[PDB]
Paper text:
[name], a fungal pathogen of rice blast, is the most devastating rice pathogen and causes a destructive decrease in rice production in epidemic years. [name], a novel elicitor isolated from [name], is an exocrine protein. In our previous work, we showed that [name] causes necrotic lesions and triggers early signaling events in the tobacco leaf defense system, and we showed that [name] also enhanced resistance to [name] in rice. Although, the [name] amino acid sequence showed up to 70% similarity to several specific plant fungal pathogen proteins, the specific function of both [name] and proteins with similar sequences are unknown.
In this study, we solved the crystal structure of [name] by X-ray crystallography using the single-wavelength anomalous dispersion (SAD) method. There were two identical protein molecules in an asymmetric unit, and only one monomer is shown. The overall architecture is a β-barrel consisting of 11 β-sheets and a very short α-helix. The short helix was located between the β9 and β10 sheet. [name] contains six cysteines that are involved in three intramolecular disulfide bridges, which occur between cysteines 27 and 151, 116 and 140, and 121 and 129. On the basis of the crystal structure, [name] showed a high similarity to the three-dimensional structure of a large family of proteins containing a thaumatin-like domain despite the low homology of their primary sequences. Of these proteins, we were interested in xylanase inhibitor TL-XI, to which [name] was most similar in three-dimensional structure. The 14 amino acid residues located in the middle region form the functional region responsible for the HR and the disease-resistance induction of the [name] elicitor. These 14 residues include a β-strand within a β-barrel and part of two neighboring loops. During the process of HR induction when interacting with its target, [name] might undergo local conformational changes around this stretch, especially in the loop regions, to expose active residues necessary for function.
Author numbering:
A (entry chain B), B (entry chain A): 18 to 152
Write the structure that this text describes.
């Protein structure tokens, strides 16, 4: 199966949880200590994978993956709309070769998808979507 | 309500035609004199809009669009994968404010979506997908 993956390279522990775009029940609340990795098989409806520094999911960054009419593409989004605990760190999000990455340098807020500057990238299926926190 | 639009600001007559993703009939083969504009209502299934300097649509540029719900995004691609008659001129493709656009300078070949580097963007609905040739 296609994978949504979040690598925690931060010193700090993070919490990751995937909220399907169809609005159904989420995946398990996942604790990632330094060096640990979250992964899940792609949810059929797409999902927003929230990443927070608290168990209560305060002000999470999210990694979104979704699909469209055009059956050829998957779409991914690295968003600071609701917050970003890693704003002073590097965060990368990649669908693999042949498509655009997010490679967001420390303190480069304008690299992320923003409420009034949305950044959602498309890429031919199949894809894995792989992020590193504190790259 | 949403429209896919092609403004021909070039000195040349151009030809535009839409090819629905769901296989329904092609749109009218549209001749745009220098200065004229093509437009169509958003097709539910999405579409490929070919843009060429010949009526036979040989080696055309294309504008691709589609849209989804949950998330409610519209997707748009400015592609030179099949050719680009307007490579020596400026071409823009914008969904309106608040989202990543294409603004492809004259002879900036890498600005377009390419076979080995796809460039497809998403934006919250509703949008008009609006291209200007020789901007």
């Amino acid at each position: 199966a296609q994978q949504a993956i979040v690598h925690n390279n931060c010193q700090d522990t993070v919490y990751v949880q995937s909220f399907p775009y169809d609005g159904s029940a989420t995946g398990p609340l996942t604790t990632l200590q330094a060096g640990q990795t979250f992964s899940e098989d792609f949810r059929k409806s797409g999902s927003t994978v929230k990443v927070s520094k608290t168990k209560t999911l305060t002000s999470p960054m999210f990694i979104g993956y979704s699909f469209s009419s055009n059956p050829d593409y998957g779409y991914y989004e690295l968003s600071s709309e609701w917050g970003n605990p890693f704003a002073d760190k590097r965060v990368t999000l990649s669908p693999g070769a042949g498509c655009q990455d997010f490679n967001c340098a420390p303190n480069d807020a304008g690299c992320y998808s923003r409420p009034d500057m949305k950044k959602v990238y498309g890429c031919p299926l199949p894809i894995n979507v792989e992020a590193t926190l504190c790259a």
